[PDB]
Amino acid sequence: MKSPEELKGIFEKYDKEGDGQLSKEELKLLLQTEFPSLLKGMSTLDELFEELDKNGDGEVSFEEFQVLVKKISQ
Numbered sequence: 001m002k003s004p005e006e007l008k009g010i011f012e013k014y015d016k017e018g019d020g021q022l023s024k025e026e027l028k029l030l031l032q033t034e035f036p037s038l039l040k041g042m043s044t045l046d047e048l049f050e051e052l053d054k055n056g057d058g059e060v061s062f063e064e065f066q067v068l069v070k071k072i073s074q
Contacts, residue, residue: 007069010034011062021061024049038072 014022014030022030027049031039043051052068053060060068 007066008062011065011069015062019059021059021064022049023059027053027060027065035072 011022011030014026017023017026024045028039028045031043031048039048049060052071053064055064
């Protein structure tokens with residue numbers, strides 16, 4: 001891997017709303033374009049936001065998303 005903190009460089013940018021986390025409006029976007037391999041066939045719209053962050057808060061911050069980035073790989 002290039003850098004372990006390579007995850008902070010993405011989510012935070014897709015946080016173009018100003019809420020600390022992403023409503024799927026900002027997530028479905030982060031998955032497509034930069035993280036296609038995951039949102040490229042499986043894990044569709046409601047299958048990535050609810051798949052790993054829906055503990056019941058219609059939102060996905062960076063640390064809920066934390067392991068998210070690690071889930072996008074081994």
